[PDB]
Design a protein around this ligand. Structure first.
Ligand code: NA
Lengths: 369, 368
């Protein structure tokens, strides 16, 4: 396997790092969420394979500063001769970061993540970074491409007109040397743009906030105004493309004839062929494709990639050719499609689970050398 | 005088390049438009100063390949001693470019711009590129900052909350260690993002098409639908923020009471205190700030800079505090301003004429 993540106890992780396969350069990585963090070491294997060994920590104190205790424990327990092989240290955190060094504040954790407070043995000076979740996820998409297994983790929804001019390899086999917009439609709607800088031969990841933009209309002014009156706020993309959004779409389908359902309930009903829930899912994806059509114009991407557990878990929806035709039609529903802008773009979807954030911490550390 | 662009005849340019001040390394630059090109040489002076000398060429044949005849004429006329000093060659063209080497196709010009067809005396190997004009414009904003005279060329419209959190120097004194969204509201509406890579402190120019985005509403559904019915297209930002857009705003302000005027006429009447033309300019700037409020959220810029001759020529509008306060209010008219996102951003406007494209060709050549 090209992408390998083993989860162990701290004590077992220490035994694994003394084995001969681990007597190589290391990257220290950490994927920090609201409840737990998964931290450890990544190495290269054969044919650009990626091998990670990580341990889980509970964020017991609901305090981002507790990470420093975890880092100190790792350095205290591991032999200095193992930690000496660390060449880079990258974590992702569930909130905004500045200077790649100062993360927060956070919705569900107290305090600020400060790279200058982290131990230099795991975070070597000038070869370390803190990333936002979506920035790490974008670097994770690049990592999958670099490991030659894009076609294992991503499926082509449709090939856009630009692909064969810009690239030699088949669509979906590599990320491509063109801008890649990463969208993460889940509870909310994360976005990041993977740019290739010709001058530097570097890819970089630009975190965005596309989800918080005001939804522009098509022929849906009454539908937008319905949600406007409910929220008391002009709707943004995430308001239509979110759990809350899917709940809204389902309420607007059934018009009081059925009880209101959660996003989870609705997706389950859709998977079972319920006409109402399927219609709610079509409406959710109509607004997702609106983000896509407008960002296709604004950002001129070669590719749009839909990532996350939700996308993988909803594979039934993307495999259905009628749903795919309806999504493609909405992706092209833009006045600028008379010039071909929306049809230029190749759309892909994640089809296999992977911790993209852990892989992206690793991939980001490679550009720090 | 830290940034100096002088226009000369070809013969006077040849005489100038033989003077002692020009006996230094040179960059060959060219700003290619639909009707003319300005091309010439740039040198560094004292204190990171920039000095350029350029000539105007007519794009008589409306054919991008005519540039090669201009390049060959310059090489034939200049002494070998002058051409020997050229260490980089960068031009910008009004259309898409791939691999920094192949430009076009173009709306207003025939043919394809091919770097591989250009003479190596003006475009030395490893050191040459073709740029899209939006890219060149963003490199030009960086050039101004690098020459230490941002406060000469750009005025602060208002300072946002984020500036003082990552810069100690006054707002408008330098580009800043943050994303800069460049907007060029002129005949149309150009956009690029000068992205800031925190991990290596690198500014990277990323051309965009924000003008072609469908306009999201505020309390203006009727106004947008009036334009929709005229264009038979859902309005995009450029449709409201363009010469055509200003002519539209003036038509709607007067409600038939005056015949239509051109965009230039409207700006002139506004400068003279005509209430109708002033209201038309307010409406233009209201949609320009909508681009700003939405992009302030989507792209999280440190700064937004309004560039171009049109901005400099309309100085009177931005000098008026009532107009500036009404622009500030629209810039903050976003649901996400309840969290302070729009108040983060510093807005600046170009206040002195400068060919940013020619400066960007130079500054891009420094990154090669
Ligand atoms: Na553990």
């Amino acid at each position: 396997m090209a992408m390998n993540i083993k989860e162990l106890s701290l004590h077992e992780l220490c035994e694994e790092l003394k084995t001969p396969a681990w007597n190589v350069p290391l990257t220290f990585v950490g994927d920090v969420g609201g409840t737990s963090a998964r931290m450890g070491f990544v190495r290269e294997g054969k044919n650009d394979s990626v091998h990670a060994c990580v341990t889980r920590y509970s964020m017991k104190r609901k305090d981002i500063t507790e990470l420093i205790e975890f880092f100190n424990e790792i350095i205290e327990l591991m032999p200095a001769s193992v930690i000496k092989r660390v060449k880079a240290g990258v974590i992702n955190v569930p909130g905004p970061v500045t200077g790649g060094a100062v993360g927060g504040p956070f919705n569900n954790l107290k305090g600020i993540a400060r790279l200058s407070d982290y131990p230099k043995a795991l975070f070597p000076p000038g070869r370390s970074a803190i990333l936002n979740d979506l920035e790490a996820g974008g670097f994770g998409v690049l990592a999958v491409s670099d490991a030659h297994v894009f076609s294992e983790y991503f499926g082509v929804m449709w090939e856009g007109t630009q692909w064969r001019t810009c690239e030699q390899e088949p669509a979906g086999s590599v990320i491509g040397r063109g801008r890649c917009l990463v969208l993460a439609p889940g509870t909310g709607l994360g976005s990041s743009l993977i740019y290739y800088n010709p001058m530097n031969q570097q890819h970089i990841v630009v975190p965005l906030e596309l989800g918080s933009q005001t939804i522009p209309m098509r022929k849906d002014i009454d539908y937008i105004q319905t949600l406007h009156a409910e929220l008391k706020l002009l709707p943004n993309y995430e308001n239509m493309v979110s759990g809350a959004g899917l709940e809204f779409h389902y309420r607007q389908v059934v018009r009081g004839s059925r009880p209101p359902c959660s996003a989870g309930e609705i997706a389950k009903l859709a998977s079972e062929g319920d006409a109402n829930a399927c219609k709610a899912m079509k409406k959710y994806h109509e607004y997702l494709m609106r983000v896509g059509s407008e960002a296709s114009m604004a950002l001129l991407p070669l590719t749009i990639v839909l990532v996350g557990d939700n996308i993988v878990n909803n594979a039934f929806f993307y495999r259905n050719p009628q749903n795919l035709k309806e999504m493609h039609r909405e992706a092209l529903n833009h006045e600028m499609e008379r010039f071909g802008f929306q049809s230029r773009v190749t759309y892909l979807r994640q089809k296999k689970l992977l911790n993209l954030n852990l892989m992206g911490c690793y991939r980001c550390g490679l550009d720090l050398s």
